[PDB]
Amino acid sequence: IIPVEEENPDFWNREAAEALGAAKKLQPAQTAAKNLIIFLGDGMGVSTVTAARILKGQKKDKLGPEIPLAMDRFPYVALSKTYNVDKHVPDSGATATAYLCGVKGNFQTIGLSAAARFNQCNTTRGNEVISVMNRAKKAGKSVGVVTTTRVQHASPAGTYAHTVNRNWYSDADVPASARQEGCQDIATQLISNMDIDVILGGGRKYMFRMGTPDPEYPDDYSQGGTRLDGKNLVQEWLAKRQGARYVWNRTELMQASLDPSVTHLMGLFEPGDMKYEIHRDSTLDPSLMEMTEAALRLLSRNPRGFFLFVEGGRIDHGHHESRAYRALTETIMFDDAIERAGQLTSEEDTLSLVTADHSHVFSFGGYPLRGSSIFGLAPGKARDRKAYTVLLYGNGPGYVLKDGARPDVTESESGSPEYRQQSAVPLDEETHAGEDVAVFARGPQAHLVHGVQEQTFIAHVMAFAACLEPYTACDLAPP
Amino acid sequence: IIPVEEENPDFWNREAAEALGAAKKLQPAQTAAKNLIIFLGDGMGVSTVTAARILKGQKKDKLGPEIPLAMDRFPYVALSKTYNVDKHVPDSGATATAYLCGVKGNFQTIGLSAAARFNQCNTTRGNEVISVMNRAKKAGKSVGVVTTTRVQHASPAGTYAHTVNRNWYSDADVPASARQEGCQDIATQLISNMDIDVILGGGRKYMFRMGTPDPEYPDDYSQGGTRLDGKNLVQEWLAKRQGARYVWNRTELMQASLDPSVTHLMGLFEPGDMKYEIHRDSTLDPSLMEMTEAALRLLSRNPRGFFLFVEGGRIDHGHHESRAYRALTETIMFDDAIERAGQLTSEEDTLSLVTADHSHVFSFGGYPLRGSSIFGLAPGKARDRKAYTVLLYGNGPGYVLKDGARPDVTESESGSPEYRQQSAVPLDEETHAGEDVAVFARGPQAHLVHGVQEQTFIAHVMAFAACLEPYTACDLAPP
Numbered sequence: 014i015i016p017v018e019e020e021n022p023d024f025w026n027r028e029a030a031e032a033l034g035a036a037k038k039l040q041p042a043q044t045a046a047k048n049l050i051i052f053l054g055d056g057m058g059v060s061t062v063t064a065a066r067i068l069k070g071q072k073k074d075k076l077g078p079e080i081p082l083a084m085d086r087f088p089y090v091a092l093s094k095t096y097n098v099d100k101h102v103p104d105s106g107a108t109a110t111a112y113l114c115g116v117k118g119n120f121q122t123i124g125l126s127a128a129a130r131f132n133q134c135n136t137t138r139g140n141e142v143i144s145v146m147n148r149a150k151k152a153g154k155s156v157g158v159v160t161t162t163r164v165q166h167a168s169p170a171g172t173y174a175h176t177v178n179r180n181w182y183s184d185a186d187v188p189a190s191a192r193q194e195g196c197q198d199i200a201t202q203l204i205s206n207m208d209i210d211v212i213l214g215g216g217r218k219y220m221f222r223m224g225t226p227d228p229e230y231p232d233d234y235s236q237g238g239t240r241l242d243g244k245n246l247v248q249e250w251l252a253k254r255q256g257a258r259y260v261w262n263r264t265e266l267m268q269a270s271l272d273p274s275v276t277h278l279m280g281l282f283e284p285g286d287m288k289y290e291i292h293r294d295s296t297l298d299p300s301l302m303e304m305t306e307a308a309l310r311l312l313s314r315n316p317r318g319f320f321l322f323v324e325g326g327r328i329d330h331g332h333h334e335s336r337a338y339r340a341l342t343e344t345i346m347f348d349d350a351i352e353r354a355g356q357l358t359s360e361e362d363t364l365s366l367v368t369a370d371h372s373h374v375f376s377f378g379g380y381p382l383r384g385s386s387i388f389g390l391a392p393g394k395a396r397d398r399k400a401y402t403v404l405l406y407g408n409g410p411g412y413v414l415k416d417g418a419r420p421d422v423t424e425s426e427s428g429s430p431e432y433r434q435q436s437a438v439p440l441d442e443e444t445h446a447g448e449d450v451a452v453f454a455r456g457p458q459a460h461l462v463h464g465v466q467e468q469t470f471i472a473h474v475m476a477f478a479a480c481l482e483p484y485t486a487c488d489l490a491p492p
Numbered sequence: 493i494i495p496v497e498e499e500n501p502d503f504w505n506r507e508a509a510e511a512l513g514a515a516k517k518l519q520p521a522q523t524a525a526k527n528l529i530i531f532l533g534d535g536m537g538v539s540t541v542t543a544a545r546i547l548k549g550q551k552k553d554k555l556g557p558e559i560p561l562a563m564d565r566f567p568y569v570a571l572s573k574t575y576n577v578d579k580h581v582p583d584s585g586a587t588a589t590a591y592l593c594g595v596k597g598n599f600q601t602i603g604l605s606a607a608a609r610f611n612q613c614n615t616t617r618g619n620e621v622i623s624v625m626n627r628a629k630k631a632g633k634s635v636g637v638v639t640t641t642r643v644q645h646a647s648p649a650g651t652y653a654h655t656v657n658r659n660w661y662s663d664a665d666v667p668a669s670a671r672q673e674g675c676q677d678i679a680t681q682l683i684s685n686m687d688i689d690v691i692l693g694g695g696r697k698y699m700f701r702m703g704t705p706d707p708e709y710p711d712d713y714s715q716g717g718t719r720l721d722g723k724n725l726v727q728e729w730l731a732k733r734q735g736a737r738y739v740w741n742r743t744e745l746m747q748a749s750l751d752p753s754v755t756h757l758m759g760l761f762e763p764g765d766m767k768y769e770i771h772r773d774s775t776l777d778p779s780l781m782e783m784t785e786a787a788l789r790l791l792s793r794n795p796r797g798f799f800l801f802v803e804g805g806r807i808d809h810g811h812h813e814s815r816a817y818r819a820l821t822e823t824i825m826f827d828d829a830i831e832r833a834g835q836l837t838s839e840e841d842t843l844s845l846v847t848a849d850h851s852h853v854f855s856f857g858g859y860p861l862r863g864s865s866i867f868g869l870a871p872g873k874a875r876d877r878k879a880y881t882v883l884l885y886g887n888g889p890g891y892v893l894k895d896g897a898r899p900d901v902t903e904s905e906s907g908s909p910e911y912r913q914q915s916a917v918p919l920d921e922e923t924h925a926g927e928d929v930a931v932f933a934r935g936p937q938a939h940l941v942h943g944v945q946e947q948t949f950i951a952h953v954m955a956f957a958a959c960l961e962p963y964t965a966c967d968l969a970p971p
């Protein structure tokens with residue numbers, strides 16, 4: 014469709030004149046950040062952002078690519094180089110070390126320098142690097158971790174944990190030799206390394222002894238407790254703090270978030286990762302936006318400010334499945350959470366960064382018409398005389414050969430929430446990609462986010478803006 | 493390989509502290525741009541930039557991803573939305589209208605508003621939109637167009653031409669009805685629409701009457717003149733100007749560039765597009781870097797300044813072939829030209845923008861080790877038990893089935909300059925992609941390049957910075 018208003022050059026000339034006017038108005042702050050928020054889109058590379066924009070624009074009443082996402086409205090953009098020390102295409106653990114601790118690490122470790130080695134417990138000590146969340150707490154700020162994954166998963170764990178193996182969710186995962194050597198599982202690290210005021214996401218099962226029924230799935234034994242050491246970590250965490258509450262459903266979360274006198278809140282809403290938004294039970298489970306608002310209600314009470322980590326964690330999981338429908342709907346909900354947090358905080362005293370840990374081998378091609386569905390077929394047949402999709406993957410589990418041939422695909426098939434887009438190379442899981450990702454920033458000192466930077470810059474600019482960490486003696490006026 | 497220096501957190505902490513220091517030093521100019529340069533990487537999306545960085549870093553003595561490209565050193569970055577009015581995944585003609593004329597257009601038209609229609613000559617008049625190069629000339633600046641494509645190809649044509657069909661290179665291409673209606677071929681438009689001081693690239697054949705032997709290939713008749721109208725456009729162009737020279741080889745180009753008294757220079761170095769850098773004859777053909785320096789020698793003589801368009805034009809062509817080796821080597825030469833132009837001009841009075849018209853369905857995945865070749869195999873076998881490459885395409889001519897199966901690939905095969913990376917979907921040509929591309933900027937008013945913008949912003953910020961176009965009464969001090 015060609016929109017009539019866009020046929021007149023004046024439309025474009027007016028828009029551009031307005032954009033120049035807005036660019037000229039922007040001015041750097043001389044003041045510090047009271048609050049810090051990092052919004053982490055796991056796997057949300059540039060192709061994901063664009064495809065999500067088109068989908069979100071269409072879900073409103075529009076053609077798609079012209080309608081800004083909430084993240085698109087952030088004034089300052091940089092590119093971030095995501096390589097881990099040992100691998101050009103990174104994982105979530107070692108990238109977390111970069112954007113939360115300010116130091117690059119080795120693939121599949123978390124919160125360690127690259128002197129440590131994956132799955133070698135005896136290389137841990139001496140190599141711990143402390144997160145800016147930890148530093149914010151040390152400075153008297155409240156701190157919160159919100160995600161749609163397990164709260165023990167690689168991204169959130171970067172805020173609090175130090176481990177040579179991101180797979181060590183509970184003691185059941187840690188080999189006996191490493192347990193003997195004192196390497197703590199991530200669930201233990203979650204309650205023990207530092208005080209965290211708000212913890213919201215998945216991961217019930219790692220907190221409870223083997224045999225403990227899950228409250229939501231008391232008749233599915235695989236969803237029960239995993240721990241070998243007999244410990245109830247939720248009860249241990251509650252015991253250590255006045256005003257602490259544990260919740261496992263939406264209604265109780267929202268109740269707790271309105272109760273002054275709560276002060277510490279742990280909400281764990283599934284045994285493992287949270288459901289995809291498209292599968293979410295709206296009576297029992299909070300959306301990402303709802304978890305972020307609940308967190309902000311509590312964190313905002315502290316006059317010294319807060320650090321919050323919010324993760325669109327299952328964007329990544331959608332791409333790994335080669336189900337763009339799931340990756341993109343998770344992206345929209347992530348952008349809705351960014352929008353909500355911007356309503357509940359002030360850019361006068363809150364530095365907000367949106368970024369991704371790494372990208373995916375996800376592409377958006379063919380030559381589709383303006384207004385067409387992102388989940389549709391490319392115009393024209395391929396050289397094998399069958400249809401193909403505008404969305405494709407380099408590799409992953411969408412690769413199919415039926416009767417020794419690439420399958421044809423229809424619009425009804427391609428638009429299904431279970432549809433897997435085709436790839437070049439069959440793998441059980443599609444792979445991350447190595448290309449630079451975007452950083453969007455707004456608020457005090459956001460103008461420092463510029464150019465092409467190492468991913469470690471994210472942690473450092475946040476520490477600097479809030480006068481933490483090695484940047485006490487920032488030269489900044491108070492928020 | 494894990495580089496020893498990177499195992500120490502101090503390495504990363506020092507780098508980040510230096511990056512913060514550099515970010516704090518940057519300050520907006522109050523002065524105008526005397527000169528404007530736009531460097532256009534045709535097809536050079538984010539995945540291309542990253543993969544090129546790694547290749548260029550390795551060609552030096554290094555591991556790859558840590559070594560900045562010249563473009564990476566530009567202080568200001570924005571994302572650019574590339575959609576054409578009628579198509580989400582754009583072509584080079586209509587994107588050119590956006591980044592050179594400041595107005596979006598319809599797929600496969602050039603220099604027209606979206607009121608015009610592809611291949612409908614009778615929708616042209618009234619819909620012409622004037623480029624910022626044209627406006628720079630009107631203001632007394634010298635202007636130049638440098639590319640590795642035909643100088644009549646879609647990108648360079650955006651600087652000077654208005655046409656409903658980018659395929660109308662010479663009169664031989666224009667249907668009789670359109671010739672009768674007065675639609676001029678692009679080669680004619682090149683010499684007739686506006687005065688251009690420097691024209692360097694390919695496209696000899698469109699300038700000369702059918703039967704005219706090419707000077708380099710006088711024994712290949714397909715490389716000869718195409719024109720039906722009997723015209724020699726080179727001679728017409730020379731006749732219209734004192735101090736004009738035409739050259740068709742490297743030695744004569746460089747001679748002409750050192751001769752004051754030349755003033756106007758047209759250098760056309762192949763019948764069609766220039767050779768890929770890897771095939772270039774270094775005695776007969778100038779590199780992109782050499783063409784840009786030759787242009788700058790002439791353009792810099794004007795005290796009022798200049799506008800220069802430089803295009804890494806065959807980055808795109810490499811991707812279309814699904815031969816990443818060609819796409820990436822063209823990218824490196826493009827970055828070398830950017831580096832050279834920065835040596836020959838001052839960021840005190842020259843606004844330089846590097847961008848792309850659109851991206852490609854090119855991805856960089858698997859989990860390769862630090863320091864490994866970008867053209868190598870991903871570690872580990874695929875689910876069909878054969879090897880695969882770290883570089884892949886969504887679609888294009890790398891798709892193969894030998895004996896009804898995906899072919900295995902070796903390192904020696906995958907590293908060859910003729911190697912085509914595999915894709916999901918066979919097409920004769922790999923497709924463009926729709927995702928946002930980067931804009932890098934340095935110089936006067938470069939701080940206005942920020943955030944996520946429409947691709948039209950590129951033309952508008954350039955016009956504004958130089959006080960042209962609708963922005964006479966910019967509010968700026970002189971350069």
Ligand SMILES: *[C@@H]1O[C@H](CO)[C@@H](O)[C@H](O)[C@H]1NC(C)=O
Pocket residue numbers: 133135136
């Ligand atoms: C870690 O443990 C293994 C024992 O199997 C040993 O080979 C290696 O030397 C140890 N490294 C250190 C730093 O002690």
Ligand SMILES: *[C@@H]1O[C@H](CO)[C@@H](O)[C@H](O)[C@H]1NC(C)=O
Pocket residue numbers: 261262264265297
């Ligand atoms: C939510 O949890 C509370 C506390 O255990 C429980 O009493 C309530 O029934 C739960 N809601 C649902 C629908 O299960």
Ligand SMILES: *[C@@H]1O[C@H](CO)[C@@H](O)[C@H](O)[C@H]1NC(C)=O
Pocket residue numbers: 612614615
């Ligand atoms: C362009 O030409 C064709 C004649 O084949 C006609 O159908 C169409 O109406 C014309 N459009 C205009 C604007 O004259």
Ligand SMILES: *[C@@H]1O[C@H](CO)[C@@H](O)[C@H](O)[C@H]1NC(C)=O
Pocket residue numbers: 740741743744776
């Ligand atoms: C370059 O062109 C000039 C001018 O026609 C010609 O005299 C010279 O021989 C050319 N060089 C080569 C190597 O062909």
Ligand SMILES: [Mg+2]
Pocket residue numbers: 055105162166167168169324326329
């Ligand atoms: Mg994650």
Ligand SMILES: [Mg+2]
Pocket residue numbers: 534584641645646647648803805808
């Ligand atoms: Mg081009």
Ligand SMILES: [Sr+2]
Pocket residue numbers: 229282283297298
């Ligand atoms: Sr639940």
Ligand SMILES: [Sr+2]
Pocket residue numbers: 708761762776777
């Ligand atoms: Sr030649």
Ligand SMILES: [Zn+2]
Pocket residue numbers: 055056104105329370371
């Ligand atoms: Zn990730």
Ligand SMILES: [Zn+2]
Pocket residue numbers: 056105329330333445
């Ligand atoms: Zn992942």
Ligand SMILES: [Zn+2]
Pocket residue numbers: 534535583584808849850
């Ligand atoms: Zn192009």
Ligand SMILES: [Zn+2]
Pocket residue numbers: 535584808809812924
């Ligand atoms: Zn192209």
